[PDB]
Amino acid sequence: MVSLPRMVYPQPKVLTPCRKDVLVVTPWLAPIVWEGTFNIDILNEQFRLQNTTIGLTVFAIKKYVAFLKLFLETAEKHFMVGHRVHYYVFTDQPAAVPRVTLGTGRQLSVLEVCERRFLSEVDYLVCVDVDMEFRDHVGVEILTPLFGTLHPGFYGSSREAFTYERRPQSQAYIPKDEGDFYYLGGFFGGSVQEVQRLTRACHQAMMVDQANGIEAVWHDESHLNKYLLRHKPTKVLSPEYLWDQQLLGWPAVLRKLRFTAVP
Ligand SMILES: CCCCCCO[C@@H]1O[C@H](CO)[C@H](O)C[C@H]1O[C@@H]1O[C@@H](C)[C@@H](O)[C@@H](O)[C@@H]1O
Ligand SMILES: [Hg+2]
Ligand SMILES: [Hg+2]
Ligand SMILES: [Hg+2]
Ligand SMILES: [Hg+2]
Fold first, then answer.
1. Does the annotation flag 130 for ligand binding?
2. Which residue range is the domain that position 27 belongs to?
3. What is the number of other CB atoms lying within 10 angstroms of the CB of residue 6?
4. What is the DSSP letter of 148?
5. Ligand 1: residue whose CA is nearest its atom 6
6. Has 151 been labeled as part of a binding site?
7. Which one of 8, 70, 156, 216 has the largest count of C-beta atoms within 10 Å of its C-beta?
8. Whose CA is nearest to atom 11 of ligand 1?
Protein backbone atom coordinates (compact mmCIF):
# COMPACT_ATOMS: atom_id res chain seq x y z
CA MET A 1 0.00 0.00 0.00
CA VAL A 2 2.29 2.78 1.28
CA SER A 3 5.64 3.56 -0.38
CA LEU A 4 8.92 2.01 0.82
CA PRO A 5 11.74 4.34 1.92
CA ARG A 6 15.18 4.64 0.36
CA MET A 7 17.18 1.48 1.09
CA VAL A 8 20.74 0.44 0.26
CA TYR A 9 21.33 -3.24 -0.48
CA PRO A 10 23.03 -5.60 -2.98
CA GLN A 11 21.56 -5.37 -6.47
CA PRO A 12 19.81 -8.60 -7.51
CA LYS A 13 21.76 -10.41 -10.24
CA VAL A 14 19.47 -11.36 -13.14
CA LEU A 15 22.12 -13.69 -14.59
CA THR A 16 23.00 -15.29 -11.24
CA PRO A 17 20.65 -17.91 -9.72
CA CYS A 18 19.92 -17.63 -5.98
CA ARG A 19 20.59 -21.30 -5.38
CA LYS A 20 21.84 -23.84 -7.92
CA ASP A 21 21.26 -26.77 -5.59
CA VAL A 22 17.53 -26.38 -4.96
CA LEU A 23 14.25 -25.43 -6.61
CA VAL A 24 13.28 -21.94 -5.45
CA VAL A 25 9.89 -21.61 -7.18
CA THR A 26 7.01 -24.07 -7.79
CA PRO A 27 5.39 -24.88 -11.17
CA TRP A 28 2.53 -22.57 -10.16
CA LEU A 29 4.98 -19.74 -9.47
CA ALA A 30 4.89 -19.76 -5.67
CA PRO A 31 8.31 -19.12 -4.11
CA ILE A 32 9.98 -21.89 -2.13
CA VAL A 33 11.58 -20.21 0.87
CA TRP A 34 15.27 -21.12 1.31
CA GLU A 35 18.00 -19.12 3.04
CA GLY A 36 19.62 -16.96 0.38
CA THR A 37 16.37 -16.31 -1.52
CA PHE A 38 15.22 -13.24 0.39
CA ASN A 39 16.34 -9.89 1.74
CA ILE A 40 14.71 -9.81 5.17
CA ASP A 41 15.22 -6.06 5.37
CA ILE A 42 12.98 -5.39 2.39
CA LEU A 43 10.33 -7.85 3.61
CA ASN A 44 10.32 -6.45 7.17
CA GLU A 45 9.74 -2.97 5.74
CA GLN A 46 6.86 -4.12 3.57
CA PHE A 47 5.11 -5.86 6.47
CA ARG A 48 5.83 -3.28 9.15
CA LEU A 49 4.23 -0.60 6.98
CA GLN A 50 1.06 -2.69 7.06
CA ASN A 51 1.35 -2.98 10.84
CA THR A 52 1.05 -6.76 10.38
CA THR A 53 -0.06 -8.94 13.30
CA ILE A 54 0.81 -12.65 13.36
CA GLY A 55 -1.07 -15.21 15.41
CA LEU A 56 0.82 -18.35 16.42
CA THR A 57 -1.34 -21.29 17.48
CA VAL A 58 -0.27 -24.37 19.44
CA PHE A 59 -2.14 -27.18 21.16
CA ALA A 60 -0.53 -28.32 24.40
CA ILE A 61 -2.60 -31.17 25.79
CA LYS A 62 -1.66 -33.43 28.71
CA LYS A 63 2.08 -34.12 28.90
CA TYR A 64 2.89 -31.71 26.07
CA VAL A 65 2.38 -28.66 28.29
CA ALA A 66 5.93 -29.40 29.39
CA PHE A 67 7.21 -28.18 26.01
CA LEU A 68 5.57 -24.75 26.29
CA LYS A 69 8.37 -23.03 28.20
CA LEU A 70 11.13 -23.83 25.70
CA PHE A 71 8.71 -23.26 22.81
CA LEU A 72 7.62 -19.78 23.92
CA GLU A 73 11.11 -18.74 25.04
CA THR A 74 12.74 -19.57 21.72
CA ALA A 75 9.79 -18.07 19.83
CA GLU A 76 10.50 -14.80 21.64
CA LYS A 77 14.05 -14.94 20.32
CA HIS A 78 13.40 -16.02 16.73
CA PHE A 79 9.73 -15.69 15.74
CA MET A 80 8.58 -12.54 13.94
CA VAL A 81 10.88 -10.39 16.11
CA GLY A 82 9.96 -6.76 15.49
CA HIS A 83 6.36 -7.44 14.52
CA ARG A 84 3.15 -7.82 16.53
CA VAL A 85 2.59 -11.41 17.67
CA HIS A 86 -0.31 -13.06 19.44
CA TYR A 87 0.24 -16.57 20.81
CA TYR A 88 -2.82 -18.78 21.19
CA VAL A 89 -2.19 -21.71 23.51
CA PHE A 90 -4.98 -24.29 23.44
CA THR A 91 -4.55 -26.49 26.50
CA ASP A 92 -6.37 -28.75 28.94
CA GLN A 93 -4.25 -27.39 31.79
CA PRO A 94 -4.51 -23.56 31.76
CA ALA A 95 -2.74 -23.27 35.13
CA ALA A 96 0.25 -25.22 33.84
CA VAL A 97 1.10 -22.69 31.12
CA PRO A 98 4.48 -21.23 32.15
CA ARG A 99 4.81 -17.50 32.83
CA VAL A 100 7.12 -16.46 29.99
CA THR A 101 8.41 -12.92 29.56
CA LEU A 102 7.30 -11.36 26.28
CA GLY A 103 8.79 -8.55 24.23
CA THR A 104 6.72 -5.43 23.56
CA GLY A 105 3.86 -5.78 21.07
CA ARG A 106 3.54 -9.48 21.84
CA GLN A 107 0.78 -11.18 23.79
CA LEU A 108 -0.43 -14.59 24.84
CA SER A 109 -3.94 -15.99 25.20
CA VAL A 110 -4.67 -19.25 26.97
CA LEU A 111 -7.79 -20.97 25.64
CA GLU A 112 -8.97 -23.95 27.67
CA VAL A 113 -10.25 -26.91 25.68
CA CYS A 114 -14.48 -18.59 18.09
CA GLU A 115 -13.03 -18.35 14.57
CA ARG A 116 -14.41 -14.82 14.15
CA ARG A 117 -12.07 -13.75 16.96
CA PHE A 118 -9.00 -14.53 14.83
CA LEU A 119 -10.48 -12.47 12.00
CA SER A 120 -10.36 -9.33 14.12
CA GLU A 121 -7.18 -9.92 16.10
CA VAL A 122 -4.63 -11.09 13.54
CA ASP A 123 -3.82 -10.86 9.85
CA TYR A 124 -2.03 -14.19 9.57
CA LEU A 125 -2.18 -17.49 11.41
CA VAL A 126 0.79 -19.82 11.81
CA CYS A 127 -0.09 -23.29 13.13
CA VAL A 128 2.64 -25.46 14.64
CA ASP A 129 3.37 -28.28 17.09
CA VAL A 130 4.42 -27.45 20.65
CA ASP A 131 7.18 -30.05 21.04
CA MET A 132 9.51 -27.86 18.99
CA GLU A 133 12.00 -25.03 19.48
CA PHE A 134 13.15 -22.17 17.29
CA ARG A 135 16.90 -22.21 16.68
CA ASP A 136 17.08 -19.49 14.06
CA HIS A 137 15.12 -16.79 12.22
CA VAL A 138 11.50 -17.44 11.25
CA GLY A 139 10.06 -14.14 10.07
CA VAL A 140 7.74 -12.44 7.60
CA GLU A 141 9.37 -14.17 4.63
CA ILE A 142 6.82 -16.96 5.27
CA LEU A 143 3.69 -14.77 5.29
CA THR A 144 1.36 -15.23 2.32
CA PRO A 145 -2.29 -16.12 1.75
CA LEU A 146 -1.52 -19.86 2.10
CA PHE A 147 1.66 -21.82 2.86
CA GLY A 148 2.71 -25.40 3.47
CA THR A 149 6.09 -26.77 4.60
CA LEU A 150 8.24 -29.44 2.94
CA HIS A 151 8.47 -32.51 5.19
CA PRO A 152 12.13 -32.92 6.30
CA GLY A 153 12.05 -36.60 5.43
CA PHE A 154 10.51 -36.61 1.94
CA TYR A 155 11.76 -33.45 0.22
CA GLY A 156 14.09 -35.52 -1.95
CA SER A 157 11.66 -38.39 -2.49
CA SER A 158 9.60 -39.22 -5.57
CA ARG A 159 5.83 -38.81 -5.29
CA GLU A 160 5.15 -42.55 -5.39
CA ALA A 161 7.22 -42.79 -2.21
CA PHE A 162 5.21 -40.09 -0.39
CA THR A 163 3.13 -41.41 2.51
CA TYR A 164 -0.11 -39.96 1.09
CA GLU A 165 -3.37 -41.73 1.91
CA ARG A 166 -3.68 -44.37 -0.81
CA ARG A 167 -7.19 -45.75 -0.14
CA PRO A 168 -9.86 -44.58 -2.65
CA GLN A 169 -12.34 -44.88 0.21
CA SER A 170 -10.73 -42.02 2.16
CA GLN A 171 -11.33 -38.35 1.36
CA ALA A 172 -7.59 -37.72 1.72
CA TYR A 173 -6.93 -40.24 -1.06
CA ILE A 174 -4.17 -39.30 -3.54
CA PRO A 175 -3.26 -41.66 -6.42
CA LYS A 176 0.36 -42.60 -7.17
CA ASP A 177 0.59 -40.35 -10.24
CA GLU A 178 -0.52 -37.20 -8.40
CA GLY A 179 1.26 -34.95 -5.92
CA ASP A 180 3.73 -32.07 -5.91
CA PHE A 181 5.36 -32.28 -2.49
CA TYR A 182 4.67 -33.95 0.84
CA TYR A 183 3.80 -31.22 3.32
CA LEU A 184 4.16 -31.40 7.10
CA GLY A 185 1.08 -31.30 9.27
CA GLY A 186 3.04 -29.49 11.96
CA PHE A 187 3.82 -26.19 10.22
CA PHE A 188 1.37 -24.44 7.93
CA GLY A 189 -0.42 -21.11 7.83
CA GLY A 190 -1.54 -18.08 5.88
CA SER A 191 -4.25 -15.43 6.10
CA VAL A 192 -6.94 -16.10 8.70
CA GLN A 193 -9.46 -16.60 5.90
CA GLU A 194 -7.36 -19.21 4.08
CA VAL A 195 -6.38 -21.07 7.24
CA GLN A 196 -10.02 -21.23 8.37
CA ARG A 197 -11.03 -22.55 4.94
CA LEU A 198 -8.36 -25.24 5.12
CA THR A 199 -9.27 -26.41 8.61
CA ARG A 200 -12.96 -26.31 7.76
CA ALA A 201 -12.39 -28.46 4.66
CA CYS A 202 -10.24 -30.84 6.68
CA HIS A 203 -12.70 -31.21 9.54
CA GLN A 204 -15.52 -32.00 7.11
CA ALA A 205 -13.39 -34.49 5.18
CA MET A 206 -12.38 -36.23 8.41
CA MET A 207 -16.04 -36.50 9.41
CA VAL A 208 -17.05 -38.09 6.11
CA ASP A 209 -14.26 -40.64 6.53
CA GLN A 210 -15.30 -41.32 10.12
CA ALA A 211 -18.89 -41.91 9.01
CA ASN A 212 -17.49 -44.40 6.50
CA GLY A 213 -15.48 -46.09 9.23
CA ILE A 214 -12.06 -45.08 7.95
CA GLU A 215 -9.11 -43.01 9.22
CA ALA A 216 -6.39 -41.72 6.88
CA VAL A 217 -2.93 -43.23 7.38
CA TRP A 218 -1.43 -40.00 8.74
CA HIS A 219 -4.66 -38.42 9.95
CA ASP A 220 -4.63 -34.61 9.84
CA GLU A 221 -1.41 -34.48 7.81
CA SER A 222 -2.97 -36.73 5.16
CA HIS A 223 -5.90 -34.36 4.72
CA LEU A 224 -3.62 -31.31 4.70
CA ASN A 225 -1.71 -32.83 1.79
CA LYS A 226 -4.94 -33.48 -0.11
CA TYR A 227 -6.10 -29.91 0.46
CA LEU A 228 -2.77 -28.38 -0.63
CA LEU A 229 -2.79 -30.57 -3.76
CA ARG A 230 -6.17 -29.15 -4.84
CA HIS A 231 -5.50 -25.60 -3.54
CA LYS A 232 -1.86 -24.77 -4.27
CA PRO A 233 -0.10 -22.85 -1.48
CA THR A 234 1.07 -19.35 -2.44
CA LYS A 235 4.42 -20.08 -0.74
CA VAL A 236 6.20 -23.28 0.26
CA LEU A 237 8.68 -23.31 3.14
CA SER A 238 11.81 -25.42 2.78
CA PRO A 239 12.70 -28.07 5.40
CA GLU A 240 14.71 -25.32 7.12
CA TYR A 241 11.43 -24.41 8.78
CA LEU A 242 10.83 -27.81 10.37
CA TRP A 243 13.76 -30.17 10.79
CA ASP A 244 14.91 -32.98 13.07
CA GLN A 245 18.69 -32.83 13.45
CA GLN A 246 18.87 -35.95 15.62
CA LEU A 247 17.06 -38.02 13.00
CA LEU A 248 18.33 -36.32 9.83
CA GLY A 249 21.55 -34.53 10.73
CA TRP A 250 22.52 -31.34 8.90
CA PRO A 251 22.72 -31.59 5.08
CA ALA A 252 24.68 -28.98 3.12
CA VAL A 253 21.44 -28.01 1.42
CA LEU A 254 20.30 -26.55 4.75
CA ARG A 255 22.21 -23.34 5.48
CA LYS A 256 20.01 -22.83 8.54
CA LEU A 257 17.93 -24.91 10.93
CA ARG A 258 15.20 -22.53 12.08
CA PHE A 259 12.52 -24.67 13.79
CA THR A 260 13.34 -28.12 15.15
CA ALA A 261 12.02 -31.09 17.07
CA VAL A 262 12.85 -31.36 20.77
CA PRO A 263 14.59 -34.71 21.39
C1 LIG B 1 12.14 -41.39 4.46
C2 LIG B 1 12.07 -42.12 5.80
C3 LIG B 1 11.20 -41.41 6.91
C4 LIG B 1 11.91 -40.56 8.10
C5 LIG B 1 10.94 -39.55 8.87
C6 LIG B 1 9.62 -40.15 9.41
O7 LIG B 1 8.91 -38.92 9.74
C8 LIG B 1 7.54 -39.17 10.07
O9 LIG B 1 6.77 -39.13 8.85
C10 LIG B 1 5.37 -39.41 9.07
C11 LIG B 1 4.71 -39.41 7.71
O12 LIG B 1 4.99 -40.62 7.00
C13 LIG B 1 4.77 -38.36 10.01
O14 LIG B 1 4.84 -37.08 9.41
C15 LIG B 1 5.54 -38.34 11.33
C16 LIG B 1 7.03 -38.10 11.05
O17 LIG B 1 7.77 -38.18 12.29
C18 LIG B 1 7.89 -37.00 13.02
O19 LIG B 1 8.72 -36.08 12.29
C20 LIG B 1 10.07 -36.57 12.07
C21 LIG B 1 10.79 -35.54 11.21
C22 LIG B 1 10.76 -36.80 13.41
O23 LIG B 1 10.87 -35.57 14.11
C24 LIG B 1 9.95 -37.80 14.24
O25 LIG B 1 10.54 -37.95 15.53
C26 LIG B 1 8.50 -37.30 14.39
O27 LIG B 1 7.72 -38.30 15.04
HG1 LIG C 1 19.41 -14.92 -4.34
HG1 LIG D 1 -4.28 -22.79 13.40
HG1 LIG E 1 -8.80 -31.68 10.83
HG1 LIG F 1 -5.84 -30.27 8.27
1. yes
2. 1-263
3. 4
4. E
5. 153
6. yes
7. 216
8. 163
